[PDB]
Amino acid sequence: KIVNIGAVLSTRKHEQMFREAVNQANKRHGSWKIQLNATSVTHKPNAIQMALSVCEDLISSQVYAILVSHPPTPNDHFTPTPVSYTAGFYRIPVLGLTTRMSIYSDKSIHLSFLRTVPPYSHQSSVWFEMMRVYNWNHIILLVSDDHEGRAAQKRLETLLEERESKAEKVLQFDPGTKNVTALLMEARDLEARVIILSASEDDAATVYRAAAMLNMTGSGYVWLVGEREISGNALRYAPDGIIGLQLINGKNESAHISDAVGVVAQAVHELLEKENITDPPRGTNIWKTGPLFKRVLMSSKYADGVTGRVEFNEDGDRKFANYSIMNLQNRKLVQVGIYNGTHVIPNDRKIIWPGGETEKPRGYQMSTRLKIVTIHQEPFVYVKPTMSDGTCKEEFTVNGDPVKKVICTGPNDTSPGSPRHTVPQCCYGFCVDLLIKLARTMNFTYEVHLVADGKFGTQERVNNSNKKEWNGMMGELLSGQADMIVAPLTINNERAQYIEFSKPFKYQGLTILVK
C-alpha cells in the first residue's frame, strides 16, 4: 500500500515542496490506503560515486519514478544519464525535467527515459512556421554539434518534406576550431540571405564576431537563432537585428515540480486501477511490468498544470509548448511575438531588422555572372595558348568573318603529366559562338574555366566507402562550382534525373570510325 518515489535535488526548499506535493497527492484522490513516502538525494561533485550511491539508495528504496531537476550544474556535461541507464536495467521509467538535449530522445539507448521539456528540434518546427509566415524557402543552416546536427537537420528535412524544398547549404565541423571564415564567404556568395545558427555559446559568439568582422551583418540579412545562442558571452557579442526564441517557464522549477508530481500521482492511480501489481527486487530478474507501465504512462492525458495541456508523444516528449519571441532591440530584449501550440501571434510591439525598414527583407539575390564549364571538343571548342602574354591572335576566316575567341583557364596536361599547370588560354569554335550569341541575346556576364580531367562524368561509388559520386562536368556542376554546362552533352535519362535540359540544338547519333 506504499509507493516509493525517488528524486535528485539539492535545495531544501524544493525538497520541502516535493514533500508537500507528495502529501497533497492523496488529497483529492479520496481516502485510499495508498501511501506516499518521499526520498531525495543531494549533490556530490563526482559522478562514479554519485551514480553508485544513487543506485544503492534507489535499490534499497524500491522507488517507482526518478526525478532530476538540476539546470544550473557547475559541470557543463549535463549528465543524469547513469541513473536512467540503471533504471532501464530494470525498466524503471525516468522523467527528465531540465536537460533538452536530443540524446535522451533516442529510446534505442535510453530505453526508460522521458521528459516534459521538448528538445531544440521543435525550434526547427517553429522556424518552419516562421518560413510559412514570411514565405522563405532557401536557408543557410550552419551546425557545429554533430550529435544533434544530424537530428536537427533530420527534423528540418521532415518539415521541408511538406514543401519538398531543400536547405541551399549545410555546414558541420568539429567545434573548437576558428578558421571558419572560408565557409562564411562561401555562404555569402549565394542568393539566400536567411542565416540560421544552432550551437553553444562559444561557437555562437565566434560566428557573430566573424560575421561582424566580414560585414556579414549588413542590410537584408535576416538571422534566426534559438535560446542557447543568445546566452552567456554570446549575448555580449550579439549583433543587433537578430531574432531569438525563448522558452516559457524554462527554469521555473517550482511549478515544474508541482506539475510533474501531479502527473506522477495521477499516473500511479491509473496504474493501480489494473491488475498484475509488481514491485522491484533488491538488486538479475527484470521488473516484468516495465514496458507495461511505460505503455500505461504513454496513454496518460491531463487537464492540470500552470503550463497547460500536458500530453506526451510516442517519444515521451511534451506537446503544444508555448514559446516567447525576443528581438535584440538596441541590446535590450523586447518581446515581439508569442507562439501557441500551433500558431504564432505577434504582439503589439514592432521588430527592427539589422538594416532599414521593419518589413521582411526578401532573403534572395541574383547574379548575371555565370560560371560556364565545358570540355575540349575537337570540332566545337578550339583551344590555343596565348601568343606572348594573355593575348589571342585575331585571326580571320576566309569569309571576312573575324574569329571570336574567349580567354579560358584550365590545366595544361593530365595530373600524372602536369602536376600543376593552369594558364589562361584562348578558346573558340562552335560552342563558344553559341554561348556568345546567348550572351548577346540576354544581358549577363560569364567566366569560363575548364574541367580538371577529360570525362563527361560518371556516378562512381567510393572504392572502399562505396559512396556514389559524380565527376567531370557533372561533378563540377553538382559541386556548385559550375552554373551552366555548355558542351556536346549526351541527353539521357540517368543525367536528366539530376539536372534539367533545354530543347536540343543538335540531331545526330553514333557511328564507327575506320581507316
Epitope: 543568445i230 546566452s231 552567456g232 549575448l235 555580449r236 525563448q246 527554469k251 521555473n252 532591440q329 538596441n330 541590446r331 535590450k332 530584449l333 523586447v334 518581446q335 510591439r349 527592427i352
Partner: antibody, heavy 119, light 114 residues
Framework: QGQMQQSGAELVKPGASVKLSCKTS????????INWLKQKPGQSLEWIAW????????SYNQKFTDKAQLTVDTSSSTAYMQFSSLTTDDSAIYYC???????????????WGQGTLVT | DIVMTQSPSSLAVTAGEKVTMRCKSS????????????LSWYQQKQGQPPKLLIY???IRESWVPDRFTGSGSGTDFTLTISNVHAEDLAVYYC???????????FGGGTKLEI
C-alpha cells in the same frame, strides 16, 4: 506593487569578500532588469552592473568588472552581488533597483531597495 | 561618457512662481531612426530614492502633475515648473538612457530652494 528587499549591514575585514542579497517580488522577475549601484554617504550613486534574469546576460562597470560578480535564483526571485577584495573604499551603501520600461522603452529606475551599508 | 551639463546649479524662488532648469548633453541623445531623445528627468528628495519624473525629455510620469514641463531636444534640454510648490523642493538630475552611449552618466544637478 513590486518590492525589493536587501540584506542587512555587514562588517567585513579589508581584503575579504561579501555577498549581498536582494529579494524581489511583485513583478515578473524573469523579464526585467536589475541594477546594483554604489552610493557612498553624501555622494551620488555609482552604477556597478546590470543583469538580465531571463538570459543570464551580465555587464559590469570596468571599475568593478574584476571586483563584483552577479548571480540570480529564479526559484526565489532574489538578486545577488558578491563583492570581493573589499577595501576601505568599499565602505558605502549599495542599492538594488528594478528598471522601469514602458512600451518596450526604458524610462528609468522605478523601484528601489531599502539600501545596505557595508563597513 | 557623455557630459551632462545642468543649469542652474541651484535656485531659490517664492511659492507660486515659475522656474526653468536646463540640461545639456555633450552629444546628441536623439537617435535618428526613431527620433526619440534618450533623456530622463528625475526628482530626488532628501533621504529617499530618486523618483523618475520625466523621460524622453518631454513625457511626464503618471504621478507627475501637469505643472512640470520638460523641453529641449538633441543636446540641450530643459525642465520647467509652471507653478512651483513647496513639496517640489528637491535636487533634480537629468540622466541619459541611450544604450549605445554607455555607461549611464548624470549631470551636476540642480538644487531647488523655496
Amino acid at each position: 506593487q513590486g518590492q525589493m528587499q536587501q540584506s542587512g549591514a555587514e562588517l567585513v575585514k579589508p581584503g575579504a569578500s561579501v555577498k549581498l542579497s536582494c529579494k524581489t517580488s511583485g513583478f515578473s522577475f524573469s523579464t526585467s532588469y536589475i541594477n546594483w549601484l554604489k552610493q557612498k554617504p553624501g555622494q551620488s550613486l555609482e552604477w556597478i552592473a546590470w543583469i538580465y534574469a531571463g538570459t543570464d546576460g551580465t555587464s559590469y562597470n570596468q571599475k568593478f568588472t574584476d571586483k563584483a560578480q552577479l548571480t540570480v535564483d529564479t526559484s526565489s526571485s532574489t538578486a545577488y552581488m558578491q563583492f570581493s577584495s573589499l577595501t576601505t573604499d568599499d565602505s558605502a551603501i549599495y542599492y538594488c533597483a528594478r528598471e522601469g520600461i514602458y512600451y518596450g522603452n526604458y524610462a528609468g529606475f522605478t523601484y528601489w531597495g531599502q539600501g545596505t551599508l557595508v563597513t | 561618457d557623455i557630459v551632462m551639463t545642468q543649469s542652474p546649479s541651484s535656485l531659490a524662488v517664492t511659492a507660486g512662481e515659475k522656474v526653468t532648469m536646463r540640461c545639456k548633453s555633450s552629444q546628441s541623445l536623439l537617435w535618428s531612426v526613431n527620433q526619440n531623445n534618450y533623456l530622463s528627468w528625475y526628482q530626488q528628495k532628501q533621504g529617499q530614492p530618486p523618483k523618475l519624473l520625466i523621460y524622453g525629455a518631454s513625457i511626464r510620469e503618471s504621478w507627475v502633475p501637469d505643472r512640470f514641463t520638460g523641453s529641449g531636444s538633441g543636446t540641450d534640454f530643459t525642465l520647467t515648473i509652471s507653478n512651483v510648490h513647496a513639496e517640489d523642493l528637491a535636487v533634480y538630475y537629468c540622466q541619459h538612457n541611450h544604450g549605445s552611449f554607455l555607461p549611464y552618466t548624470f549631470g551636476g544637478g540642480t538644487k531647488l530652494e523655496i
